[PDB]
Amino acid sequence: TSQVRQNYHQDSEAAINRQINLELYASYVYLSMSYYFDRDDVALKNFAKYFLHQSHEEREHAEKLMKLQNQRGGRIFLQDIQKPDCDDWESGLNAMECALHLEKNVNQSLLELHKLATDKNDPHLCDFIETHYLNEQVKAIKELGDHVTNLRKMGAPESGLAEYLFDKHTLG
Amino acid sequence: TSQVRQNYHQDSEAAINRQINLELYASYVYLSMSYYFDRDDVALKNFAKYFLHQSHEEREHAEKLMKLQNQRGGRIFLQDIQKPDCDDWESGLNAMECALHLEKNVNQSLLELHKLATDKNDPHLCDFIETHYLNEQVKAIKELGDHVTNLRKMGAPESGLAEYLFDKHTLG
Amino acid sequence: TSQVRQNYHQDSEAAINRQINLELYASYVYLSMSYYFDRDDVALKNFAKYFLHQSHEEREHAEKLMKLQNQRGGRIFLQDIQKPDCDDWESGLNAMECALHLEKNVNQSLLELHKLATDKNDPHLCDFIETHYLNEQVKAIKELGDHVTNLRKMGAPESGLAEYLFDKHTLG
Amino acid sequence: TSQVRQNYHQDSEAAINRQINLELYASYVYLSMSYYFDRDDVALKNFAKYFLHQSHEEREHAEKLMKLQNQRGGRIFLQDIQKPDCDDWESGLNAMECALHLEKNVNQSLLELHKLATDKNDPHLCDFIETHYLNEQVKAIKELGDHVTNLRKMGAPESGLAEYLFDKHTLG
Amino acid sequence: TSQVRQNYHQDSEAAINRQINLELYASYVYLSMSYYFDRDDVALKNFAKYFLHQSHEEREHAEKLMKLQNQRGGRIFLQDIQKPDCDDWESGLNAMECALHLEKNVNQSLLELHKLATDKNDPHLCDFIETHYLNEQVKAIKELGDHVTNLRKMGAPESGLAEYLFDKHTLG
Amino acid sequence: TSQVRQNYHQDSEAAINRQINLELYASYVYLSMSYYFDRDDVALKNFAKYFLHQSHEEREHAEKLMKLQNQRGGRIFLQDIQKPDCDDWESGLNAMECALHLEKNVNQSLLELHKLATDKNDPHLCDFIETHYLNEQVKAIKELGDHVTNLRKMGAPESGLAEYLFDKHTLG
Ligand SMILES: [Zn+2]
Ligand SMILES: [Zn+2]
Ligand SMILES: [Zn+2]
Ligand SMILES: [Zn+2]
Ligand SMILES: [Zn+2]
Ligand SMILES: [Zn+2]
Ligand SMILES: [Zn+2]
Ligand SMILES: [Zn+2]
Ligand SMILES: [Zn+2]
Ligand SMILES: [Zn+2]
Ligand SMILES: [Zn+2]
Ligand SMILES: [Zn+2]
Ligand SMILES: [Zn+2]
Ligand SMILES: [Zn+2]
Ligand SMILES: [Zn+2]
Ligand SMILES: [Zn+2]
Ligand SMILES: [Zn+2]
Ligand SMILES: [Zn+2]
Ligand SMILES: [Zn+2]
Ligand SMILES: [Zn+2]
Ligand SMILES: [Zn+2]
Ligand SMILES: [Zn+2]
Ligand SMILES: [Zn+2]
Ligand SMILES: [Zn+2]
Ligand SMILES: [Zn+2]
Ligand SMILES: [Zn+2]
Ligand SMILES: [Zn+2]
Ligand SMILES: [Zn+2]
Ligand SMILES: [Zn+2]
Ligand SMILES: [Zn+2]
Ligand SMILES: [Zn+2]
Ligand SMILES: [Zn+2]
Ligand SMILES: [Zn+2]
Ligand SMILES: [Zn+2]
Ligand SMILES: [Zn+2]
Ligand SMILES: [Zn+2]
Ligand SMILES: [Zn+2]
Ligand SMILES: [Zn+2]
Ligand SMILES: [Zn+2]
Structure with missing residues (x-):
């Protein structure tokens, strides 16, 4: 100890x-x-x-x-x-979809860690997870959802033009 | 009083x-x-x-x-x-169309307020509306009409590519 | 969804x-x-x-x-x-009293939203409300209470001199 | 009230x-x-x-x-x-040990205050303690533990050379 | 020793x-x-x-x-x-009166310490007390007396207006 | 292909x-x-x-x-x-010894990759490994050997004083 x-x-x-x-x-x-x-x-x-x-x-x-x-x-x-x-990873859209999935799994893990903190009456840990992790997760998931939506709306993944233009105008 | x-x-x-x-x-x-x-x-x-x-x-x-x-x-x-x-609000084009409609209604209201000023011989009010409101309205309506036209010409609202590119190149 | x-x-x-x-x-x-x-x-x-x-x-x-x-x-x-x-709104003091009342009602709403977050095991929401809203509310309520107290102690609302001087020396 | x-x-x-x-x-x-x-x-x-x-x-x-x-x-x-x-206070090492003990007692008090906040459904107080006190406590305790460890490893308290060098190279 | x-x-x-x-x-x-x-x-x-x-x-x-x-x-x-x-502490005036009383007691203690220095033929201590303490005490007591006088003359403590204005114009 | x-x-x-x-x-x-x-x-x-x-x-x-x-x-x-x-990892000296061992294994791998390049008549790969990897490896191994030697000569790992002073005067 x-x-x-x-x-x-x-x-x-x-x-x-x-x-x-x-x-x-x-x-x-x-x-x-x-x-x-x-x-x-x-x-x-x-x-x-x-x-x-x-x-x-x-x-x-x-x-x-x-x-x-x-x-x-x-x-x-x-x-x-x-x-x-x-x-x-197939296409920009597919990678973004996979990233979104990843981040939601990481978020789920962090929410379970937070539940554990609550259950064990560990407010220092609650604060650590809330302050440094939970909103970063929400921001990441929202950003990735926005990227997926744009790419789908532009005609990705079949439109290579779409992925090309997104790469320049959003990720550039 | x-x-x-x-x-x-x-x-x-x-x-x-x-x-x-x-x-x-x-x-x-x-x-x-x-x-x-x-x-x-x-x-x-x-x-x-x-x-x-x-x-x-x-x-x-x-x-x-x-x-x-x-x-x-x-x-x-x-x-x-x-x-x-x-x-x-459906699409960028639809929102712009709705905004154009809105601004024309606001303009109509301002033109009625101006008529009232004329009818009541209130040149201070005439000037207030003319100076601060009427040309702002005309500018707003022209700008919104330009946006609607571009979006239609680009293939909006069916083209999500169109709305995406307009968002970057006109509104960006 | x-x-x-x-x-x-x-x-x-x-x-x-x-x-x-x-x-x-x-x-x-x-x-x-x-x-x-x-x-x-x-x-x-x-x-x-x-x-x-x-x-x-x-x-x-x-x-x-x-x-x-x-x-x-x-x-x-x-x-x-x-x-x-x-x-x-009657007087500076009355407006400040009304604002204090308002802010306490907004705070009560935020505390109910926070209880809901707890009840639904939503620590991201707990953090959002705690970080961005709860202390702003406490600060606002304390400030408004201070203003009410000063105004009362100065002789407001019957003393227009009091409200005048407060406007210059506290709000100025 | x-x-x-x-x-x-x-x-x-x-x-x-x-x-x-x-x-x-x-x-x-x-x-x-x-x-x-x-x-x-x-x-x-x-x-x-x-x-x-x-x-x-x-x-x-x-x-x-x-x-x-x-x-x-x-x-x-x-x-x-x-x-x-x-x-x-005997020696640098002993003082650091005493400080570590002190800070753990202060932390214990803060954790009881936080439990009270939870029990009384006071999220403003929870946030105040989490934001301003709990991580400061964890940082202080970790720092003091590090100091104790270094001093012990250097040969304190019997080595006055050790305490002298620590005073210059860590606390200096 | x-x-x-x-x-x-x-x-x-x-x-x-x-x-x-x-x-x-x-x-x-x-x-x-x-x-x-x-x-x-x-x-x-x-x-x-x-x-x-x-x-x-x-x-x-x-x-x-x-x-x-x-x-x-x-x-x-x-x-x-x-x-x-x-x-x-009741009122600004009362607090200032209490402070004045406090400082005169601290001064009395310092004057007894100085007498002790004289009695023990300790000119280093005499100098320490004279240089660092006695005039600071006289300045503090004079300042506090000035504050009490102003507050009384302005109508404190019954006039909350008085205390308010003093807070801004003297202590501000 | x-x-x-x-x-x-x-x-x-x-x-x-x-x-x-x-x-x-x-x-x-x-x-x-x-x-x-x-x-x-x-x-x-x-x-x-x-x-x-x-x-x-x-x-x-x-x-x-x-x-x-x-x-x-x-x-x-x-x-x-x-x-x-x-x-x-036991002690600073032990970690440095382990790092030295690690780097020699990485070097051995890079030398086998270089032999393969020679054997396959791939001078672009030869150059890549020579330019970007081989001298970095030699430098790393020499540095780690120097650290091990100093730590041993200072009395590490039994002397915690030694590791403490090395941490400040070499790695600081
Ligand atoms: Zn595997
Ligand atoms: Zn992530
Ligand atoms: Zn992460
Ligand atoms: Zn929590
Ligand atoms: Zn918490
Ligand atoms: Zn927090
Ligand atoms: Zn790093
Ligand atoms: Zn309605
Ligand atoms: Zn408008
Ligand atoms: Zn308008
Ligand atoms: Zn007119
Ligand atoms: Zn006119
Ligand atoms: Zn004009
Ligand atoms: Zn405004
Ligand atoms: Zn209504
Ligand atoms: Zn508010
Ligand atoms: Zn608000
Ligand atoms: Zn909460
Ligand atoms: Zn929380
Ligand atoms: Zn805004
Ligand atoms: Zn005692
Ligand atoms: Zn402390
Ligand atoms: Zn403390
Ligand atoms: Zn809490
Ligand atoms: Zn909380
Ligand atoms: Zn302070
Ligand atoms: Zn006592
Ligand atoms: Zn004093
Ligand atoms: Zn003093
Ligand atoms: Zn003397
Ligand atoms: Zn003297
Ligand atoms: Zn100090
Ligand atoms: Zn004034
Ligand atoms: Zn394995
Ligand atoms: Zn390496
Ligand atoms: Zn490497
Ligand atoms: Zn070669
Ligand atoms: Zn070569
Ligand atoms: Zn990198």
Whole structure:
């Protein structure tokens, strides 16, 4: 038991470790998406840049959780970072749809972590999740939904013109 | 009777109060339109920004009328601000068409207020309406007509590509 | 159902729409108060400025709720904005008392919205209300109570000297 | 009953007064520690500076609680500030250990105040404690644990060389 | 016996410790007064600011005595800081009267400490008290007397107008 | 077959994918080390900063390989990123020893990739590895060897004083 540990349940500590893994996994998914759009037979550079930026941001989200774990006197336990489900992400629209799905799963995990905090009467953890994670999730999901809608309305994925113009005018 | 009141007919005072309400109503219509384009299943941010700017401007038009009322020694009498006719505004083109209709109704009201000023021999009121309202109305109506024309010519509302490109290249 | 909607109860969505209306109503009350103090037979310009600033701020509070509604995938449903209870607000002290009453009612509404968030296990909504609304309400209520106290202690509303000096030295 | 008081339980008001006292007590403990390290037969100036900075900060924490009490319409009731348990704090390591103990007790008090807020359905108070107090406590406890660990690992308290070097390289 | 101790009587050391407590007590009295004027049913912000500034200054006076104690090789012995005599300070005038009384008591203590220095042939202590304390006391007492006189002459405490105007024009 | 692919052997493409994984693994190892030194019972902040910087750099090394893969018309195939061998890294010296071992393994992999380039007559790949990877590896290995030597010579790992001073004077 850490000299700093106070009001920090074992289940909370465990849930923080699972969340660290999931943020790293999200970082990996976006890394994979980024370089998909970098392929010469896809060649959408702003989609590539956009997803690379999200990949780095996910990694910072994981790091903030690792910091929290140590702050509370928990012990970080790392697990393998699983490869993403896809190697080929099909189209800008499909990637955006997949990202939306991803972010909703990450949000679901964060909402379960928050429920756990409530159940264990851990308001420091409640605040950490509310302040640093919940609104970032809502913003990300809204942004991704907006992107999906625009791409669909423009005629993606069948219209390569649509994806090209979106890459320049929204992601550019 | 106000110590400042001079050459200010009761009918003029009443008409100014109705005009205050109508400007507020216009502010509300544009507010509703703005957040329609902010929906995740619409997602046209510059349409949203454009209509939000018009909403604020309408509110300032109402405030200038309230100032005029007090300047002339009239008494402001506020009425409910009615919700707009629509909750769902359908498409960028439809919203622009509705705005054009709105502005022509506001203009018609202002032209009746001006006729009243003429009929009551109130040149201060004539000048107020001519200087601050009539050309703003003509400019707004011309701008909205231009937007409707472009959107129609581009293939809106069936072309979501059209609305997307207009949002970037005209409203952006 | 919105593609972005997650953990967002229908009752929460409905309560957000009622809160949007109430913020707009508060904007209207303060607008009415502002121009009351602008009357030539009242003529307290800093009271007028103070209430106009609050009117604009209320409108921004309503806009932030409309943004939240769309962020969460709810659907904004606007209602009429009711005219305020008063046309004539009597005195600076009376207006401040009325504002205090208003803000306590808005606070009560926000506390019920927060209870609903708790009851529906919606920590994103809890955070939104806590972060953006609850302390603003406490600050507003404390400020208005301070103003009421000063005005009473100075001899308002019977002392027009008192209201005049307060307008210059506190609201100026 | 204050004109501003709303949703503010008597038990919450009482708990805020006890917390004000405890913050003042913490300010006193750190003041005592600071001047201990200022003694000619101790003579660790950065330990002295570090604890003096914490003493001032505690006093500001107490002041923010007094502000909150008045904001909510509670009534501040001050109690004696008890002298610290020690006059002689022994060594840098011992002082850091004592500070760690202190901060964990302050944290425990804040967690009980937060539980009370939950129990009384006072989300404004929940937010105040979460936003302004809980993470400051976690940060302080982590920092103090880090200092204790370094000092122990360096050979303190038996190594005066260790305390000297820590004073320069960590607290300097 | 400290290696630095020279010409420093035990009675002087003891008197310095009592003076440290009294300065801390004065800091507490002013802290209590400050937040009294911050109450929503008092609401004199410059009285609040003025007394808060004095509270901080008293704390610095206590710190300078603790520094002196260590400089001379004495040993600081802290005592409880007693709560002030009042929770409710009644009016600006009454608070100023109480402050005047306080400062005259602090001055009396400092004059006894100076007599002790003379009696023990401790010119370093004489100089410390003369240079850093005696004229600050005379200035504080004169300032407080001036404030009391103005407030009385303006019609305080019965005139809340008087206290309001003094807060703006003297303490503002 | 990519339209851009030229002189790029399938075995080279495969080896680049394995190298991408190994760089990611190295990023993970350093991430784990970084937060180990961030623990309250380790508390060496510059060791933590140093390893965090290496973690980010490894991630950039992986990204440059993914860019190369696409440049050459190869297809990126991601694999799981394995958790590091250790959860607890024991001491600064042990972590540095482990890092040295890691970097020598990464170097061995890069030397095999270079041999493959030679064997497949791929001078573009030879140049890529020589220019961007081989000297970075030699520099990293030399730096880590220097750190190990200093730490051993200072008395690490038994001397916590040694690790503390190294953290400040070399990694600070
Ligand atoms: Zn994330
Ligand atoms: Zn990072
Ligand atoms: Zn796997
Ligand atoms: Zn994410
Ligand atoms: Zn919570
Ligand atoms: Zn909470
Ligand atoms: Zn919060
Ligand atoms: Zn208008
Ligand atoms: Zn305005
Ligand atoms: Zn209606
Ligand atoms: Zn208009
Ligand atoms: Zn005319
Ligand atoms: Zn004319
Ligand atoms: Zn003209
Ligand atoms: Zn509001
Ligand atoms: Zn706005
Ligand atoms: Zn009505
Ligand atoms: Zn309000
Ligand atoms: Zn809540
Ligand atoms: Zn919450
Ligand atoms: Zn504190
Ligand atoms: Zn302060
Ligand atoms: Zn005691
Ligand atoms: Zn503290
Ligand atoms: Zn809470
Ligand atoms: Zn809460
Ligand atoms: Zn003093
Ligand atoms: Zn100080
Ligand atoms: Zn006592
Ligand atoms: Zn004093
Ligand atoms: Zn003397
Ligand atoms: Zn002398
Ligand atoms: Zn004046
Ligand atoms: Zn590498
Ligand atoms: Zn990168
Ligand atoms: Zn594995
Ligand atoms: Zn490396
Ligand atoms: Zn070669
Ligand atoms: Zn070569």
